[PDB]
Write a protein that binds this ligand. Sequence first.
Ligand SMILES: CN[C@@H]1CCc2c(ccc(O)c2O)[C@H]1O
Length: 286
Amino acid sequence: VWVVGMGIVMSLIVLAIVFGNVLVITAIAKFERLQTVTNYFITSLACADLVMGLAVVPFGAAHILTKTWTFGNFWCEFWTSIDVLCVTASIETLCVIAVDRYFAITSPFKYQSLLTKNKARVIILMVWIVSGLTSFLPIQMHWYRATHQEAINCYAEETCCDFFTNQAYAIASSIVSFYVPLVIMVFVYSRVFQEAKRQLQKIDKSEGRFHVEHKALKTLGIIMGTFTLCWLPFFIVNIVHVIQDNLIRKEVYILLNWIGYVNSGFNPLIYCRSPDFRIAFQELLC
Ligand SMILES: CN[C@@H]1CCc2c(ccc(O)c2O)[C@H]1O
């Protein structure tokens, strides 16, 4: 009953991810009003999420359900590289969005000059190049491999493929993928909240006698509680399991990894709540 039951959940996850991340892309492509410098970062994020949902989730689900890797030994390194690439490219895009929002409020007069359609493309290409220099190059050159008997036995068997990595690669990959964007987003959003509070105070001092921070708190909570709660638990055990051998089990690692995969299915709800997006979604369907 467990085999039949979980397959339904995995298929539902796949369908939700694909349907969520294709609609945004086609709405942005079809409509000329939504083509804005802001909306290119959402385009890149949606592309990364769609690639993840199509390439990573189905094969991981099949590997779990079948319990053996029926495909060749060459196709598992490619799968791991794709997974790492998508994961590390789906977070720096959020960091870029946060920085772009910071520059709008902090410098209102100079926002148009600093951000131009030519610079957005360069930023996106740099993000994707950096993502590809930590996923394909070290994995495909066999620099991440660990040196112990279980790892060698797993490497020499075609039907078995698990993740065994070194201390240095794990630390470097986690630092590049998660922690630096986390610090940058924390600083950015704290400053934005400070500016919003100052504006509210000024309005209250000016027009106080007439009736005419819940909004900022709710928005920032939705922004920063669906990302930290989804990715932070995994990137701690990622550091831990290479320092203490018996502290972290394999099942906990796999489940905490799969919890962070569903974040790609939530992004359209969080970042595409604008009325302009709603009108486009209504026009496409119905
Ligand atoms: C196969 N799962 C991988 C394992 C390690 C890893 C992931 C994502 C980002 C990283 O920086 C990593 O080091 C996970 O997606």
